[PDB]
Amino acid sequence: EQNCTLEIESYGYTTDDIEFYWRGDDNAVTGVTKIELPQFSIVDYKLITKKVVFSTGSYPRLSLSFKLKRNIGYFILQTYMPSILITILSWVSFWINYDASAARVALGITTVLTMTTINTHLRETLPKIPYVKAIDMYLMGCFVFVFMALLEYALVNYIFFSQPARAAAIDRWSRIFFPVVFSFFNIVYWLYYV
Amino acid sequence: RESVPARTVFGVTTVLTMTTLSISARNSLPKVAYATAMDWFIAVCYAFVFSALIEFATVNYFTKSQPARAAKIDRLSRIAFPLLFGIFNLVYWATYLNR
Amino acid sequence: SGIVQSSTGEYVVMTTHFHLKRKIGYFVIQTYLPCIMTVILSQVSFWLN
Ligand SMILES: *[C@@H]1O[C@H](CO)[C@@H](O[C@@H]2O[C@H](CO)[C@@H](O[C@@H]3O[C@H](CO)[C@@H](O)[C@H](O)[C@@H]3O)[C@H](O)[C@H]2NC(C)=O)[C@H](O)[C@H]1NC(C)=O
Numbered sequence: 001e002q003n004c005t006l007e008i009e010s011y012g013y014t015t016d017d018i019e020f021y022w023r024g025d026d027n028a029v030t031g032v033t034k035i036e037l038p039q040f041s042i043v044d045y046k047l048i049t050k051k052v053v054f055s056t057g058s059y060p061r062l063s064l065s066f067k068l069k070r071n072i073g074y075f076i077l078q079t080y081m082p083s084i085l086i087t088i089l090s091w092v093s094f095w096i097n098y099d100a101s102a103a104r105v106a107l108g109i110t111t112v113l114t115m116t117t118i119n120t121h122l123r124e125t126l127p128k129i130p131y132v133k134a135i136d137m138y139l140m141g142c143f144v145f146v147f148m149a150l151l152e153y154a155l156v157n158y159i160f161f162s163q164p165a166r167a168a169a170i171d172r173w174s175r176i177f178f179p180v181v182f183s184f185f186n187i188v189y190w191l192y193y194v
Numbered sequence: 195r196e197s198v199p200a201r202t203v204f205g206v207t208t209v210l211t212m213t214t215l216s217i218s219a220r221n222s223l224p225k226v227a228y229a230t231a232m233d234w235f236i237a238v239c240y241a242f243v244f245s246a247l248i249e250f251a252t253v254n255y256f257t258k259s260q261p262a263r264a265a266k267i268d269r270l271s272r273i274a275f276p277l278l279f280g281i282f283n284l285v286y287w288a289t290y291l292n293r
Numbered sequence: 294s295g296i297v298q299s300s301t302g303e304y305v306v307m308t309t310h311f312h313l314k315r316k317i318g319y320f321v322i323q324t325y326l327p328c329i330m331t332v333i334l335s336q337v338s339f340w341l342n
Pocket residue numbers: 003004005044045046048050063065066067
Protein backbone atom coordinates (compact mmCIF):
# COMPACT_ATOMS: atom_id res chain seq x y z
CA GLU A 1 0.00 0.00 0.00
CA GLN A 2 1.38 3.40 -1.01
CA ASN A 3 0.24 6.42 1.01
CA CYS A 4 0.50 9.27 -1.53
CA THR A 5 -0.17 12.77 -0.21
CA LEU A 6 -0.63 16.33 -1.44
CA GLU A 7 0.52 19.06 0.94
CA ILE A 8 -0.86 22.60 0.64
CA GLU A 9 0.92 25.41 2.48
CA SER A 10 1.10 29.20 2.39
CA TYR A 11 4.47 30.56 1.34
CA GLY A 12 4.81 33.95 2.99
CA TYR A 13 1.93 34.39 5.43
CA THR A 14 2.05 32.89 8.92
CA THR A 15 -0.91 31.83 11.04
CA ASP A 16 -0.91 35.37 12.43
CA ASP A 17 -1.95 36.55 8.94
CA ILE A 18 -3.69 33.64 7.20
CA GLU A 19 -5.58 30.54 8.31
CA PHE A 20 -6.43 27.48 6.21
CA TYR A 21 -9.37 25.10 6.42
CA TRP A 22 -11.36 22.69 4.30
CA ARG A 23 -14.65 24.25 3.21
CA GLY A 24 -17.08 21.63 4.51
CA ASP A 25 -14.31 19.97 6.50
CA ASP A 26 -15.34 16.49 5.36
CA ASN A 27 -16.82 16.87 1.85
CA ALA A 28 -14.24 19.42 0.74
CA VAL A 29 -12.66 16.83 -1.58
CA THR A 30 -14.92 15.27 -4.19
CA GLY A 31 -14.50 13.09 -7.24
CA VAL A 32 -12.08 10.74 -5.49
CA THR A 33 -14.36 7.70 -5.32
CA LYS A 34 -14.87 7.98 -9.09
CA ILE A 35 -11.14 7.64 -9.86
CA GLU A 36 -10.34 4.44 -11.77
CA LEU A 37 -6.59 3.81 -11.72
CA PRO A 38 -5.18 1.05 -13.94
CA GLN A 39 -2.82 -0.44 -11.37
CA PHE A 40 -4.10 0.72 -7.97
CA SER A 41 -7.35 1.31 -6.09
CA ILE A 42 -8.02 4.20 -3.72
CA VAL A 43 -9.04 2.51 -0.48
CA ASP A 44 -9.28 5.67 1.66
CA TYR A 45 -8.56 9.38 1.65
CA LYS A 46 -7.97 11.66 4.63
CA LEU A 47 -8.15 15.42 5.09
CA ILE A 48 -5.77 16.85 7.69
CA THR A 49 -5.59 20.53 8.60
CA LYS A 50 -2.90 21.73 10.98
CA LYS A 51 -0.38 24.44 11.81
CA VAL A 52 3.24 23.44 11.40
CA VAL A 53 5.87 25.20 13.51
CA PHE A 54 9.07 26.55 11.99
CA SER A 55 11.65 28.99 13.32
CA THR A 56 10.09 32.32 12.35
CA GLY A 57 6.51 31.28 13.11
CA SER A 58 3.80 28.72 12.51
CA TYR A 59 2.50 28.30 9.00
CA PRO A 60 -0.89 26.80 8.11
CA ARG A 61 -1.19 23.58 6.17
CA LEU A 62 -3.71 21.19 4.67
CA SER A 63 -2.98 17.65 3.58
CA LEU A 64 -4.92 15.37 1.23
CA SER A 65 -3.72 11.80 1.69
CA PHE A 66 -4.75 8.88 -0.53
CA LYS A 67 -4.01 5.27 0.34
CA LEU A 68 -3.40 3.33 -2.87
CA LYS A 69 -3.67 -0.46 -2.60
CA ARG A 70 -2.01 -2.16 -5.55
CA ASN A 71 -4.10 -4.71 -7.43
CA ILE A 72 -2.62 -8.18 -7.33
CA GLY A 73 -4.41 -10.42 -9.84
CA TYR A 74 -2.26 -9.24 -12.73
CA PHE A 75 0.99 -9.78 -10.90
CA ILE A 76 -0.16 -13.25 -9.83
CA LEU A 77 -1.12 -14.21 -13.38
CA GLN A 78 1.96 -12.77 -15.07
CA THR A 79 4.82 -13.47 -12.65
CA TYR A 80 3.93 -16.08 -10.05
CA MET A 81 1.96 -18.61 -12.10
CA PRO A 82 4.76 -19.11 -14.67
CA SER A 83 7.41 -19.48 -11.98
CA ILE A 84 5.36 -21.91 -9.88
CA LEU A 85 4.51 -24.06 -12.88
CA ILE A 86 8.14 -24.10 -14.02
CA THR A 87 9.16 -25.24 -10.54
CA ILE A 88 6.62 -28.07 -10.73
CA LEU A 89 7.82 -28.91 -14.24
CA SER A 90 11.34 -29.13 -12.82
CA TRP A 91 10.03 -31.55 -10.21
CA VAL A 92 8.68 -33.73 -13.04
CA SER A 93 12.22 -35.03 -13.58
CA PHE A 94 11.92 -37.13 -10.42
CA TRP A 95 9.30 -39.50 -11.79
CA ILE A 96 11.54 -39.93 -14.84
CA ASN A 97 13.64 -43.02 -14.25
CA TYR A 98 17.28 -42.81 -13.21
CA ASP A 99 18.58 -44.24 -16.50
CA ALA A 100 16.96 -41.44 -18.49
CA SER A 101 20.05 -39.27 -18.16
CA ALA A 102 19.50 -37.16 -21.27
CA ALA A 103 15.83 -36.77 -20.38
CA ARG A 104 16.34 -35.56 -16.83
CA VAL A 105 19.23 -33.29 -17.84
CA ALA A 106 17.14 -31.74 -20.60
CA LEU A 107 14.25 -31.13 -18.22
CA GLY A 108 16.31 -29.69 -15.37
CA ILE A 109 18.66 -27.54 -17.41
CA THR A 110 15.86 -26.18 -19.59
CA THR A 111 13.93 -25.33 -16.43
CA VAL A 112 16.97 -23.38 -15.22
CA LEU A 113 17.08 -21.62 -18.59
CA THR A 114 13.37 -20.79 -18.46
CA MET A 115 13.66 -19.45 -14.91
CA THR A 116 16.54 -17.24 -16.01
CA THR A 117 14.54 -15.99 -19.00
CA ILE A 118 11.53 -15.20 -16.82
CA ASN A 119 13.72 -13.40 -14.30
CA THR A 120 15.55 -11.32 -16.92
CA HIS A 121 12.37 -10.38 -18.79
CA LEU A 122 10.43 -9.42 -15.67
CA ARG A 123 13.52 -7.40 -14.75
CA GLU A 124 12.69 -5.26 -17.80
CA THR A 125 8.88 -5.31 -17.67
CA LEU A 126 8.80 -4.40 -13.99
CA PRO A 127 9.66 -0.81 -13.02
CA LYS A 128 13.39 -0.33 -12.51
CA ILE A 129 13.63 -0.25 -8.72
CA PRO A 130 17.27 -0.83 -7.76
CA TYR A 131 16.55 -2.27 -4.32
CA VAL A 132 15.28 -5.75 -3.47
CA LYS A 133 11.56 -6.56 -3.57
CA ALA A 134 9.26 -9.41 -2.58
CA ILE A 135 8.77 -10.40 -6.21
CA ASP A 136 12.54 -10.71 -6.55
CA MET A 137 12.70 -12.83 -3.40
CA TYR A 138 10.06 -15.18 -4.81
CA LEU A 139 11.79 -15.47 -8.18
CA MET A 140 15.05 -16.22 -6.38
CA GLY A 141 13.28 -18.88 -4.34
CA CYS A 142 11.94 -20.58 -7.45
CA PHE A 143 15.36 -20.40 -9.09
CA VAL A 144 16.98 -21.94 -6.02
CA PHE A 145 14.47 -24.79 -6.06
CA VAL A 146 15.15 -25.52 -9.73
CA PHE A 147 18.86 -25.43 -8.87
CA MET A 148 18.38 -27.87 -5.99
CA ALA A 149 16.34 -30.25 -8.14
CA LEU A 150 19.05 -30.36 -10.80
CA LEU A 151 21.75 -30.85 -8.16
CA GLU A 152 19.69 -33.68 -6.69
CA TYR A 153 19.66 -35.32 -10.10
CA ALA A 154 23.42 -34.83 -10.35
CA LEU A 155 23.89 -36.50 -6.97
CA VAL A 156 21.64 -39.40 -7.98
CA ASN A 157 23.59 -39.88 -11.20
CA TYR A 158 26.95 -39.73 -9.42
CA ILE A 159 26.11 -42.16 -6.62
CA PHE A 160 23.94 -44.52 -8.66
CA PHE A 161 26.34 -47.13 -9.96
CA SER A 162 27.78 -47.78 -6.50
CA GLN A 163 24.38 -48.24 -4.84
CA PRO A 164 21.08 -48.21 -6.77
CA ALA A 165 19.26 -48.71 -3.47
CA ARG A 166 20.45 -45.40 -2.04
CA ALA A 167 19.95 -43.76 -5.43
CA ALA A 168 16.28 -44.77 -5.48
CA ALA A 169 15.79 -43.91 -1.80
CA ILE A 170 17.17 -40.42 -2.44
CA ASP A 171 14.93 -40.06 -5.48
CA ARG A 172 11.80 -41.04 -3.55
CA TRP A 173 12.66 -38.83 -0.58
CA SER A 174 13.21 -35.83 -2.85
CA ARG A 175 10.00 -36.64 -4.74
CA ILE A 176 8.10 -36.53 -1.46
CA PHE A 177 9.93 -33.61 0.17
CA PHE A 178 10.42 -30.92 -2.47
CA PRO A 179 6.66 -30.37 -2.80
CA VAL A 180 6.59 -30.21 1.00
CA VAL A 181 9.38 -27.64 1.19
CA PHE A 182 7.81 -25.65 -1.66
CA SER A 183 4.46 -25.49 0.12
CA PHE A 184 6.28 -24.46 3.30
CA PHE A 185 8.16 -21.74 1.41
CA ASN A 186 4.96 -20.51 -0.22
CA ILE A 187 3.17 -20.36 3.13
CA VAL A 188 5.95 -18.48 4.90
CA TYR A 189 6.38 -16.04 2.01
CA TRP A 190 2.69 -15.27 1.50
CA LEU A 191 2.07 -14.87 5.23
CA TYR A 192 5.14 -12.65 5.68
CA TYR A 193 4.22 -10.37 2.76
CA VAL A 194 0.55 -10.08 3.74
CA ARG B 195 6.53 -44.00 -25.87
CA GLU B 196 10.02 -45.53 -25.67
CA SER B 197 11.81 -42.39 -26.92
CA VAL B 198 12.06 -40.69 -23.54
CA PRO B 199 14.78 -38.13 -24.38
CA ALA B 200 13.11 -36.97 -27.58
CA ARG B 201 9.68 -36.64 -26.00
CA THR B 202 11.13 -34.92 -22.91
CA VAL B 203 13.06 -32.31 -24.87
CA PHE B 204 10.02 -31.87 -27.11
CA GLY B 205 7.72 -31.07 -24.21
CA VAL B 206 10.08 -28.98 -22.12
CA THR B 207 11.24 -26.76 -24.97
CA THR B 208 7.63 -26.42 -26.11
CA VAL B 209 6.97 -25.04 -22.64
CA LEU B 210 9.91 -22.67 -23.06
CA THR B 211 8.53 -21.52 -26.42
CA MET B 212 5.17 -20.87 -24.77
CA THR B 213 6.90 -18.91 -22.00
CA THR B 214 8.69 -16.71 -24.52
CA LEU B 215 5.44 -16.15 -26.41
CA SER B 216 3.61 -15.17 -23.21
CA ILE B 217 6.33 -12.74 -22.17
CA SER B 218 6.44 -11.13 -25.60
CA ALA B 219 2.65 -10.99 -25.80
CA ARG B 220 2.31 -9.08 -22.55
CA ASN B 221 4.74 -6.34 -23.62
CA SER B 222 1.90 -4.77 -25.64
CA LEU B 223 -0.87 -4.67 -23.04
CA PRO B 224 -1.20 -1.70 -20.68
CA LYS B 225 -0.65 -2.73 -17.07
CA VAL B 226 -4.23 -3.53 -16.16
CA ALA B 227 -5.10 -5.12 -12.81
CA TYR B 228 -7.07 -8.01 -14.30
CA ALA B 229 -7.12 -10.59 -17.05
CA THR B 230 -7.82 -9.61 -20.64
CA ALA B 231 -9.23 -12.00 -23.22
CA MET B 232 -5.75 -12.56 -24.59
CA ASP B 233 -4.58 -13.28 -21.04
CA TRP B 234 -7.21 -16.00 -20.64
CA PHE B 235 -6.25 -17.46 -24.01
CA ILE B 236 -2.54 -17.47 -23.17
CA ALA B 237 -3.08 -18.96 -19.71
CA VAL B 238 -5.31 -21.71 -21.11
CA CYS B 239 -2.77 -22.58 -23.80
CA TYR B 240 0.07 -22.55 -21.27
CA ALA B 241 -1.91 -24.87 -19.01
CA PHE B 242 -2.50 -27.16 -21.99
CA VAL B 243 1.23 -27.41 -22.68
CA PHE B 244 1.96 -28.06 -19.01
CA SER B 245 -0.72 -30.75 -18.96
CA ALA B 246 0.69 -32.42 -22.07
CA LEU B 247 4.08 -32.62 -20.38
CA ILE B 248 2.46 -34.05 -17.24
CA GLU B 249 0.66 -36.59 -19.42
CA PHE B 250 3.95 -37.72 -20.93
CA ALA B 251 5.42 -37.97 -17.43
CA THR B 252 2.57 -40.27 -16.38
CA VAL B 253 3.03 -42.37 -19.52
CA ASN B 254 6.75 -42.76 -18.92
CA TYR B 255 6.25 -43.60 -15.25
CA PHE B 256 3.72 -46.35 -16.02
CA THR B 257 5.66 -47.67 -19.03
CA LYS B 258 7.74 -50.82 -18.44
CA SER B 259 5.41 -51.60 -15.49
CA GLN B 260 1.85 -51.25 -16.84
CA PRO B 261 2.45 -50.89 -20.59
CA ALA B 262 -1.22 -51.65 -21.17
CA ARG B 263 -2.04 -48.59 -19.06
CA ALA B 264 0.61 -46.44 -20.74
CA ALA B 265 -0.67 -47.19 -24.23
CA LYS B 266 -4.28 -46.85 -23.07
CA ILE B 267 -3.73 -43.35 -21.70
CA ASP B 268 -1.79 -42.38 -24.83
CA ARG B 269 -4.60 -43.49 -27.14
CA LEU B 270 -7.15 -41.75 -24.91
CA SER B 271 -5.15 -38.50 -24.83
CA ARG B 272 -4.72 -38.39 -28.61
CA ILE B 273 -8.50 -38.04 -28.86
CA ALA B 274 -9.11 -36.07 -25.64
CA PHE B 275 -6.60 -33.21 -25.87
CA PRO B 276 -7.46 -31.80 -29.33
CA LEU B 277 -11.17 -32.50 -28.82
CA LEU B 278 -11.00 -30.35 -25.67
CA PHE B 279 -8.79 -27.58 -27.07
CA GLY B 280 -11.00 -27.15 -30.13
CA ILE B 281 -14.19 -26.80 -28.10
CA PHE B 282 -12.41 -24.36 -25.79
CA ASN B 283 -11.43 -22.25 -28.79
CA LEU B 284 -14.96 -22.38 -30.18
CA VAL B 285 -16.52 -21.20 -26.93
CA TYR B 286 -13.90 -18.48 -26.40
CA TRP B 287 -14.22 -17.02 -29.88
CA ALA B 288 -18.01 -17.26 -29.82
CA THR B 289 -18.24 -15.40 -26.52
CA TYR B 290 -15.78 -12.64 -27.42
CA LEU B 291 -16.60 -11.89 -31.07
CA ASN B 292 -20.30 -11.36 -30.28
CA ARG B 293 -19.98 -8.74 -27.51
CA SER C 294 33.85 28.63 -0.83
CA GLY C 295 36.37 29.26 -3.58
CA ILE C 296 37.41 31.62 -6.35
CA VAL C 297 37.18 30.69 -10.04
CA GLN C 298 39.31 32.49 -12.62
CA SER C 299 37.85 32.80 -16.11
CA SER C 300 38.55 34.88 -19.20
CA THR C 301 36.14 37.53 -17.90
CA GLY C 302 37.40 37.97 -14.34
CA GLU C 303 37.53 36.36 -10.92
CA TYR C 304 34.28 35.11 -9.41
CA VAL C 305 33.24 33.83 -6.00
CA VAL C 306 31.88 30.29 -6.11
CA MET C 307 30.00 28.57 -3.26
CA THR C 308 30.27 24.75 -3.66
CA THR C 309 28.45 21.98 -1.83
CA HIS C 310 29.49 18.39 -2.49
CA PHE C 311 26.87 15.77 -1.64
CA HIS C 312 28.35 12.35 -0.88
CA LEU C 313 26.50 9.29 -2.18
CA LYS C 314 27.13 5.57 -1.74
CA ARG C 315 25.43 3.04 -3.99
CA LYS C 316 23.39 0.14 -2.66
CA ILE C 317 24.51 -3.37 -3.57
CA GLY C 318 21.62 -5.54 -2.40
CA TYR C 319 19.93 -5.41 -5.78
CA PHE C 320 22.89 -6.35 -7.96
CA VAL C 321 23.84 -9.07 -5.47
CA ILE C 322 20.60 -11.01 -5.90
CA GLN C 323 19.99 -9.94 -9.50
CA THR C 324 23.35 -10.58 -11.20
CA TYR C 325 25.92 -11.96 -8.76
CA LEU C 326 23.90 -14.86 -7.34
CA PRO C 327 22.53 -15.96 -10.74
CA CYS C 328 26.07 -15.84 -12.15
CA ILE C 329 27.54 -17.77 -9.23
CA MET C 330 24.81 -20.41 -9.42
CA THR C 331 25.37 -20.72 -13.16
CA VAL C 332 29.10 -21.31 -12.64
CA ILE C 333 28.38 -23.83 -9.87
CA LEU C 334 25.94 -25.61 -12.17
CA SER C 335 28.51 -25.71 -14.97
CA GLN C 336 31.06 -27.26 -12.62
CA VAL C 337 28.54 -29.80 -11.30
CA SER C 338 28.70 -31.33 -14.78
CA PHE C 339 31.93 -33.06 -13.75
CA TRP C 340 30.11 -35.32 -11.30
CA LEU C 341 28.09 -36.99 -14.07
CA ASN C 342 29.43 -40.21 -15.51
C1 LIG D 1 -0.72 8.94 5.14
O1 LIG D 1 0.30 9.27 6.07
C2 LIG D 1 0.04 10.47 6.80
C3 LIG D 1 1.28 10.77 7.61
O2 LIG D 1 1.35 9.94 8.76
C4 LIG D 1 -1.20 10.25 7.66
O3 LIG D 1 -1.50 11.44 8.37
C5 LIG D 1 -1.69 11.16 9.76
O4 LIG D 1 -3.06 10.93 10.06
C6 LIG D 1 -3.35 10.72 11.44
C7 LIG D 1 -4.83 10.41 11.53
O5 LIG D 1 -5.60 11.53 11.11
C8 LIG D 1 -2.95 11.95 12.25
O6 LIG D 1 -3.19 11.71 13.63
C9 LIG D 1 -3.90 12.83 14.20
O7 LIG D 1 -3.01 13.68 14.91
C10 LIG D 1 -3.63 14.89 15.35
C11 LIG D 1 -2.54 15.77 15.95
O8 LIG D 1 -2.99 17.12 15.90
C12 LIG D 1 -4.75 14.56 16.35
O9 LIG D 1 -5.46 15.74 16.70
C13 LIG D 1 -5.73 13.54 15.74
O10 LIG D 1 -6.69 13.15 16.72
C14 LIG D 1 -4.99 12.33 15.17
O11 LIG D 1 -4.42 11.66 16.28
C15 LIG D 1 -1.48 12.25 12.01
O12 LIG D 1 -1.12 13.47 12.65
C16 LIG D 1 -1.20 12.39 10.51
N1 LIG D 1 0.22 12.61 10.28
C17 LIG D 1 0.69 13.65 9.60
C18 LIG D 1 2.18 13.73 9.48
O13 LIG D 1 -0.04 14.50 9.11
C19 LIG D 1 -2.37 9.89 6.76
O14 LIG D 1 -3.51 9.62 7.56
C20 LIG D 1 -2.03 8.69 5.87
N2 LIG D 1 -3.11 8.45 4.92
C21 LIG D 1 -4.15 7.63 5.15
C22 LIG D 1 -4.16 6.90 6.47
O15 LIG D 1 -5.03 7.47 4.32
